Amino acid sequence: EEMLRKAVGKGAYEMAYSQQENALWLATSQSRKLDKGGVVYRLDPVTLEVTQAIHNDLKPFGATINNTTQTLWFGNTVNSAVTAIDAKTGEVKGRLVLDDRKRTEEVRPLQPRELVADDATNTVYISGIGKESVIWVVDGGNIKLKTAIQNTGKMSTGLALDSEGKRLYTTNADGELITIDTADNKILSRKKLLDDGKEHFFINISLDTARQRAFITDSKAAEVLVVDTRNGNILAKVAAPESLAVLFNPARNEAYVTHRQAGKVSVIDAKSYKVVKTFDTPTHPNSLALSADGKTLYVSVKQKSTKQQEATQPDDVIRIAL
């Protein structure tokens, strides 16, 4: 319905929402050439006005929040690290380097991508992408590395957590869905979701744990997958443009999907498995966030920026009253 576009800053990416603080956070990397480090912006959930600017010496990209500890967790992609920030005070609690290797021509350090927090065990799971990706398991209590789950495939970007079921899911560029037992950090199964001889980059995944199903985006194909998390069988193929982020809303039984190249956001009705609404978010939408009540959707919208020519305008956040 009602849409509000608000400029925040350059290099906007992922977001996190806190009902306790009644606030929204946006990770910004700022200018890649002029700025060393980045800023995490605290935003008014109604007006999107900056209510706090947290300067970071490492650029933040991915974002998640532990609702029990009220601790924000950000992925430092270009530094192979994760940052913990107190959501109430805004103080940086500490950082952990996940790949301290120096970059050469043969050595390419793994970079954090997605982050999910287990409020029950205070555990942070971080997807470290690369040729041979991993899942980093971080102790939220003392910001220390517990272990690194091996062999998640090529560019295993996706990450979603089933806290009660003790199941962790990740998706990669090998077209497979990987299920992990969080009780011992071991891969329980992996299944190639499609056997059509086509290339499939499953970038993101969002869970409907109540019905044991997952929504998975694909940047190489023009359809969003709905998958049964018990066996990996495909429940539906929703026709939509090439997709990046996906967020399921249990309060409305809908899934929202960003289309970077199309410049749009799709609303997928999870009962009929059809796109019932498309939001106009011109110029590369990126990440999604929902208010606690499921009534407000937040979309980070990025300007066109290249490796040679950066954007001269800041990125935006769009607030959509559902």
What sign has the CA pseudo-torsion 180, 166, 203, 227? positive
Separation CA 275–CA 240 (nearest Å):
7
**What are the respective helix, strand and coil percentages of the chain, to the nearest 5?**
0, 50, 50
Resolution (A): 2.5
DSSP-derived 3-state class of residue 255? strand
Strands (E), 202-243: 205-208, 213-216, 223-228, 234-239
Phi and psi, residue 43, nearest 5°: -120, 145
Separation of alpha carbons 185 and 154, rounded Å: 19
Q: Are 171 and 154 in contact (CB under 8 A)?
A: no
List the domain boundaries for the chain.
1-322
Measured CA to CA in angstroms, residue 192 lies from 44, 139, 188, 225, 234 at distances of 42, 31, 14, 12, 11
Task: Output the six-digit token pair for 198.
Answer: 């086509």
Is 80 in contact with 110 (CB distance < 8 Å)? yes
Phi, psi angle pair for 79, to nearest 5°: -125, 0
Rg from Cα positions in the chain:
18
- How many CA within 13 A on the CB side of residue 178? 29
Quickly count helices (H) and strands (E) in the chain.
0, 28
* DSSP conformation letters of 131-192: SS-EEEEEETTTTEEEEEE----TT----EEETTTTEEEEE-TTSEEEEEETTTTEEEEEEE
* Token pair belonging to 298: 């937040």
